[PDB]
């Protein structure tokens, strides 16, 4: 319970959150840019034309990533629940 | 006399459950329920029953020592409770003095303008109780707030993913709740929780 | 058990009311996660330590005039509770205005249902900054301050003054000041991204911030929020000291003006 | 009493609060926080503490007059709950009557159909409160509209400077969010608000 | 018989506030703040207080009549619920039959398979209350719908003006809060409301 | 027996309230106010009271039978054990059987693994209640589904129109509420609802 | 003595209901109401009654055994609960042991460090109750997570259809509350739920 | 209760909705298209130039149509809420 | 509550709202056309070149028209809120 | 409760969701693209001009799909609720 431990808690939390969320968001941005380039250059653009592929991409990437995105949480929540009696002491 | 009698209906049992345990376990479960979305577990029966069962478990040796030492001669009712209290307070005190942090003892010994004590058993009960309860609050919150963080991370990840697509007008608290159930039963999360709360308590 | 002693038990009720007031108004320190019969248990325990050694001998006369006296205590308790919570409101406000700059802020429109933006970030910074109290002392400093007010502003005829309530009411005040001071680097970095996405529109108007913006700025707002965690550790030390100086100053100012 | 007493006690804190002030303050704080996007303050704690401290400060002289002219003389002699209630109502009456619009009194005298009234304080206590509350609601919404103006100007100029260059798609709701805070604290805004709500109250 | 007694208490105030008034007032207020964007008023204090004062004044004639009929011989507490029901109801009955659509009672007499229907007491107590509340809800929703129109006007004007300039991405629902507020305080729009809810009520 | 009395005051009201009616009604109102956007009725005060009154009118024959066949002879206080409970349940049995789906009693006769059950009075208490409740909830969800359709029509229409002109910015849930009140006071939608919940109930 | 009497009066009504059933059922229903948008069915009234009735149906055989083995000798009052509680504990002991996980018994024995366990009644009650309740919670959350999936499918397919053709602003929690009532009376889901919770319970 | 009657309900509701919202968006589309054609051949176009006639058109069309649109709903909601006591069984 | 009175209310409110929003969008369209035509005859256009005049024109027209635009609303709102106790009965 | 069984439930639900959602948004995307390609080559391009066809297309497609899109849910929810008593142990 030293203010180094309390800040290490947060520094681990945000790193796990980034590791989880960054693949999905990066696929979303990649699909967005790939279609937005095709959006111009043959100028045609209504408004979206791209939210549908931005759903296809996430729906694919979640199944492809799958297991280890689970394993991260499984490991870290377990270590948390195991170290709880030593955080106090 | 509707006032004086009826206030002691909850006063005395609550104080008797403030002495030993059941003050931190309620708080841990209540923080759990503050996370994990909506109530999803009715306090009126479920959390109270659970947190009373676990306390009757954890305090089994204490009640055993009381039962042998004071309860059994109280069947004779030898003396009005003087040693019944004392020889029952000493297991209670020894159990209490083990969990009271140091700062709280010194502080509440200052606030009473007490004299220097030679023995821990010399610490009067009116000085011990509030220090114990304060220490228990400040450890119950130290466990509870350390429980949240994964739940809040799931919340943040779900919210960011939803807003990444264009779904502004969805209450991501409603899509969170199932994932915060699978990641609770999937890591056996309840057994870890109760084993921790029952181990870290006495140690 | 007759009413003989109940009127002697009526001696503790005023400090009891003051301490229950200080407890009820500082929830993030002692909040609704606690059962109301434990949050009230602390009171009668604490006063039993405090009630003796006080020269407090008062009487609830017929059609009690000391009901007016009940006005006094609830104020001082409130004066401590509703004051101590600026150390949390500052970090909550620093947290909110960050998340509101990436994706969370589309509750700008007419009142939706629940907030749904608070639970993202401002519920974590309020939690960390709630663990940092418990490492130094949560109520111990506060209960000592209130023990002192039991000596300075005891009980009675001259209830309270003014011009100090105005002091701590103009005080925050510093809520938004500290709110900036924390998040200034994150906000400054994110403004540059928000304007950088702009200069793309002049090149091709199809970049439709719903297509590019949020998937980009969300990852960066998580990155920077990870890289700026340790800075919260020495900063919270100020937010505690400044407000404790505030409290001690005003609590010492009030009685000499009586 | 058995029934009416407890219900009356529960209703009391709303009665005392509405009668005097604190119904004009909280609305201004709410409107303030409604400017600058989301709440940006925990209502149930902060914007109630501040809004109660201001009210007690503003109403201290009234309570001083009440104390001096009622409690100290009613003590030990010379008044029995009749002249005390009177000499305590009169300052609070003079406090309200200064704030009520002139029309609202006429309206609530017409619909309640009160007879020939001669004294302003002679207006019964029941007729005072609702007209007061309505008048204060009007004044509070007035103050709130006066508050909203500079933030509107900020948003308009920022949106224009955006579209002056070609930023059609970019939602200026984000860019203009930090500027509000920067120019609300850089000019020390909060002190101006308590200043105005203190001066414009009695004037 | 302790069972039924306390069971009656937990509801009795709630039903009492159903028998007379304060329903349509509170519903109109609730539908008021649904316009003007956010709540913007603390229902805990202001709206309930206003709704209580208004209903007190509106009922003052029939309330004082009930006082004279029952509470004055109730100085002796004459008869427990024999004519206090009658001399409480005949005022209540006239009060609701002045307010109840004649067709609602026709429907609630059809389903009851009624026979002789000559006097108000020939319309049993169990028949009035539901018909009364249905009529009250219809009136309150009429008033509420009539309220919304100028605010719709303002919102559509602002939205169309923004979309005309090429302001495609500014949230006009957030710009139009001070304009509603000012154009509602200008017309003295709070006198008219508590005057209409007091004139249209008795009739 | 002091114990069972407070446990009765806790549970028995909720039991008797589920045993007759008032379960199908409340779900309907609760699903209704889920349409129309905001609450639009203070459930603590209005909807609960109305739903209690509707039932107090609907169960007039059952309550009359119960009174005349139990409590008028209970002035004698003949027996409070056998015919107090047994004879009093004879009307309830019919009132619940008449509205109980057939497939349900089959399922809960099958699970309990009973032998020959021919008589509905030979159907013990415990097989009746849960089947009745499941049936009621099914029919209430049916009515609630049929309700929502015109409101969905209106909201989809308005949203489509708004998107047609390019008005992405506008929150269509704010324009569609006054129309949701117009279409609900114009067809007298409030008389028909209570008429339906009163006619279809007994059948 | 009378002190612990009212102490038990405050708790025991919750202790007993925890001991048998009613802790998986309520939690499953509460996790249901969190799906289907808004808390439609009111927890204060309906779910408590439904869950209590269903638990009575399931516990009828255990209640029959308890009756014939305790109350019939309690008619005589053979001994002062010395075997009425004892013999009455056997059916509850075996009943819990049937559904009690085997790993939870192991863990909670390890936390107490008990030696060789051979017989069923070699399991002390203070080892059952906590392990029993944690097992019931595991099961309840398993059922609750399994219930959600189709509601998630509906919500996400609706939300992904809306934002496919503009309409980014319609709050899909309005279009998806009907569909969750078509799907839920169309498949008769109110019979499948209660059937499964009644069947899987005994095992 | 069968998926057949629920499909009948759907065929009714969707047809009512189409008849209700046809003229509004029809005239919207028509005015918009005819203007946007004029925005070529004399190419002049800043951004919108066309939202104003889309307002005038719907403004005229609501006033013209008016009562019969409302009569539709008053009739069909009546039929719905009158058949309500038989959908039970 | 006849569906005729709830058509009279709408027919009044629509015309009042049109009276309000008329000059604003009229001058908006006027200025828009006037500028966009001059995007020929030294045709050169960057993207818009025409937002600022649309702003100064509305800023002029608001203060020019002003008080009577306020008066329309101030009158008819008073009329509505004074006629409330008659629509009920 | 191994993360393999939860993965099986997940992959089943995602296949059901794909089957439910394919035709609706597929037709949406198809008609949107088909119109957008017409926005060039006759450069006329108002703002959307295609939100209406994307409505009529879904109106047609839901009618055509109809029964089996509902039968999928009816069957899968049935098997789910029937297998529930066998997931506990």
Author numbering:
A (entry chain G), H (entry chain I), I (entry chain J), J (entry chain H): 1 to 89
B (entry chain A), D (entry chain E), E (entry chain D), F (entry chain C), G (entry chain B): 43 to 245
C (entry chain F): 5 to 262
Question: What is written in the article reporting this PDB entry?
Answer:
Export of proteins through type III secretion systems (T3SS) is critical for motility and virulence of many major bacterial pathogens. Proteins are exported through a genetically defined export gate complex consisting of three proteins. Here we present a re-refinement of the original FliPQR data to higher resolution (3.65 Å) and also the structure of the equivalent SctRST complex from a virulence T3SS (3.5 Å), revealing the high level of structural conservation within this core complex between flagellar and virulence T3SS.
We have recently demonstrated that a subset of these proteins assembles into a core export gate complex and reported the structure of a flagellar FliP5Q4R1 complex (here termed FliPQR) at 4.2 Å by cryo-electron microscopy (cryo-EM). Strikingly, placement of the FliPQR structure into lower-resolution basal body structures revealed that this complex, built from three putative membrane proteins and purified from membranes when expressed in isolation of the rest of the T3SS, physiologically exists in an extramembrane location at the core of the basal body. This positioning of the complex, in conjunction with the observation that it exhibits helical symmetry, suggested that it seeds assembly of the axial helical components that culminate in the flagellum or needle. Re-refinement of the original Salmonella enterica serovar Typhimurium (S. Typhimurium) flagellar FliPQR data using RELION-3 (19) yielded a significant improvement in the resolution of the density, as estimated from both Fourier shell correlation (FSC) curves and the level of detail visible in the volume. We have remodeled and re-refined the coordinates into the new volume, and although there are no substantial differences, the level of confidence in these coordinates as accurately representing the biological object is clearly increased.
